[PDB]
Amino acid sequence: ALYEYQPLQIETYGPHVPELEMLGRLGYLNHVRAASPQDLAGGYTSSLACHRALQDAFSGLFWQP
């Protein structure tokens, strides 16, 4: 059997987090602090902060014990 990539499917119980490319063209990144060149030099970008905040905000929004 050969391999083919399957994305990991985990229920978040919340709204859809925008895809990484939507963060740029829809302007999500305009509302997070811009990464300084010293940050970009190590690999840290503003899309990391924006993406995690978006995921934590939507995670479990619709989950009721």
């Binding site: 999500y28 905040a53 905000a57 995670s59």
Partner: protein
Amino acid sequence: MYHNSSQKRHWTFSSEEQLARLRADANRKFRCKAVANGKVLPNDPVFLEPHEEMTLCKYYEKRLLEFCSVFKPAMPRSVVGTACMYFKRFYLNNSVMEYHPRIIMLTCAFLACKVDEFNVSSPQFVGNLRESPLGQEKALEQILEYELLLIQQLNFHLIVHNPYRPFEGFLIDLKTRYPILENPEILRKTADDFLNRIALTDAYLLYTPSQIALTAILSSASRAGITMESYLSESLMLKENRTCLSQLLDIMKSMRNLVKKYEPPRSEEVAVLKQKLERCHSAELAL
């Protein structure tokens, strides 16, 4: 992540009554243990009532909030919410009569500084206690004695999800997709106060951090007289799943009612209960 977290799986409960039963259960077990040791009678008035343990926990929780706000190395907010979460979880199944809330609230903050990776040394931590260097060392010894006990009573579930990052996530989404609200930053002040209010209730044990954060924002918008039901139906696309829109609206109403019926601990009542609690420990009912 929260949606598969131990916090959601084991430390998010369905009702206030379930919380009250667990706390009353811890109170009753200590009474049985104390009476079994043959020092006290089944209804000696030295025992605290479940509602009296709660009043003392509200008090020492505010003292824990006050301790963190003056912590010399500026303490990140996520350390404080983690410490308060530990404090709530510990006395869900333990009695203030057996483990003193003064020592436990410091152990919660001490453990939270390690879990959240807020690296302060032990002398830096107890140095924030306004006591003599003789007493600051005594407090450190007691913290290290209750440290393992706290982790055991948490079932070794240490990661706590706070509503602070979810709060920022909604603001990003508000600023990006909801132009109806011109400048979403006006709500931060009042939503932050509303967020601090629910932190004193049992909402951390009853709702997801995302729902808590959205409640604080929408409540602040209600205070500012701003309609944003379209943010839920249109922007969050809850027009499609009406049952999920209904549940979420009920959760936010339930949370706002939790804050409406919050009773702050009265200073005179605390003085009496601290006196009774101190007598309970000095008699050493454990053995």
